[PDB]
Amino acid sequence: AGPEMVRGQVFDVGPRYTNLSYIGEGAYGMVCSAYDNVNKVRVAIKKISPFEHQTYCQRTLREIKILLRFRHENIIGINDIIRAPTIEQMKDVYIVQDLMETDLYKLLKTQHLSNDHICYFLYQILRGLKYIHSANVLHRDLKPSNLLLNTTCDLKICDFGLARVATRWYRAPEIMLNGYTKSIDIWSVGCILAEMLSNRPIFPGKHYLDQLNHILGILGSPSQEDLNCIINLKARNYLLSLPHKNKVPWNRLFPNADSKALDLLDKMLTFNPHKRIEVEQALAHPYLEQYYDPSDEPIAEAPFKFDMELDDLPKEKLKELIFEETARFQPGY
Ligand SMILES: CN(C)Cc1cccc(Nc2ncc(Cl)c(-c3csc(C(=O)NN4CCOCC4)c3)n2)c1
């Protein structure tokens, strides 16, 4: 019996992995669960087909190298990698990882979170993000659909394809001019907090202009100091063209949320990245006092550093590096 297929997509991961089930898909990849007939468990498998585009090749190499170096309870790992025995044959790369029960996206579509769970999930997101930022890496695309949850309420951050060393509903406002710094991740976590408090996106713009209006609709018109953070000229001009907007207090939007939760949300969703809170201070905020435990919150031993200029490399070079990096999982290595 030939190779497995999932929604007309071949999934050439047997004989070890079988009984595939669709989970989701991105721009150049698909995710399924499968049965691992060695460890007698179900696993997650992300198929990645990036080699047509230099950008996809950089993100794939970055994703693999970062996830193989990171070792943290709140961050998805890589257990196995499958690809063809020769570089000429390699069209796809399959990354095998721990299977989780669901993601925060789906959870928030069907469940109301107690203040306790919101607190505990927020702690874990930030605890993972502390490890991440401690290594001088940015995730850059945190969102409910890549925060994974287990039966026992354990959370893991996944999809590091966009990560870099230091929808669009979670993009910080600095980015909607563009400057990727650690504070864009805190913005995303702020938006995630809001969504956990209400079950609806806080800034659900149809496009970037419409997202800016949502943001200003709650934060109010930016100050002049805040306007000096907005480097891009079209954006700055646009902001200067708008009528004044008043700041809406957080407890009017979330009338039944914990006061501490709202005080932290306020500091995470701050227009000016320079004044936005940082991950350790977030973790030490009173709202999180029930879980904050710096004695058991690991950081990376050293800053992550790429020794090559991936941006500069032609997609053929990248593919060779991807062949190299995945060698160690190939039989007979
Ligand atoms: C419906 N039934 C399947 C339940 C369910 C629902 C969602 C998740 C999981 N479990 C799980 N376990 C391990 C992993 Cl590794 C992943 C995973 C999902 S997506 C992804 C990634 O890399 N995704 N990117 C592309 C898609 O958009 C987001 C980013 C990794 N999921 C189970």
Author numbering: 9 to 174, 190 to 201, 204 to 358
What does the study report here?
SKLB-D18 tightly occupies the ATP-binding sites of ERK2. The 2-aminopyrimidine group is anchored in the ERK2 kinase hinge regions, forming vital bidentate hydrogen bonds with Met108. Additionally, the chlorine atom at the 5-position of pyrimidine forms a halogen bond with the gatekeeper residue Gln105. The carbonyl group on the amide establishes a hydrogen bond with Lys54, while engaging in water-mediated hydrogen bonding with Gln105. The morpholinyl group forms a hydrogen bond with Asp167 via its nitrogen atom, while its oxygen atom participates in additional water-mediated hydrogen bonding with Lys151. Ultimately, the 3-((dimethylamino)methyl)phenyl moiety, extends into the solvent-exposed region, contributing to the enhancement of physicochemical properties. Structural analysis revealed that the SKLB-D18 in complex with ERK1/2 establishes a more extensive interaction network compared to its binding with ERK5, as evidenced by (1) additional hydrogen bonds at the binding interface, (2) enhanced hydrophobic complementarity, and (3) optimized electrostatic interactions. Meanwhile, the structural alignment showed that the binding mode of SKLB-D18 to ERK1 is similar to that of ERK2. SKLB-D18 exhibits nanomolar potency against ERK1/2 and ERK5 with half-maximal inhibitory concentration (IC50) values of 38.69 ± 0.62 nM, 40.12 ± 0.95 nM and 59.72 ± 1.21 nM, respectively. The isothermal titration calorimetry (ITC) assay further confirmed the binding affinity of SKLB-D18 to ERK1/2/5, with a dissociation constant (Kd) of 126.9 nM, 209.8 nM and 468.2 nM, respectively.
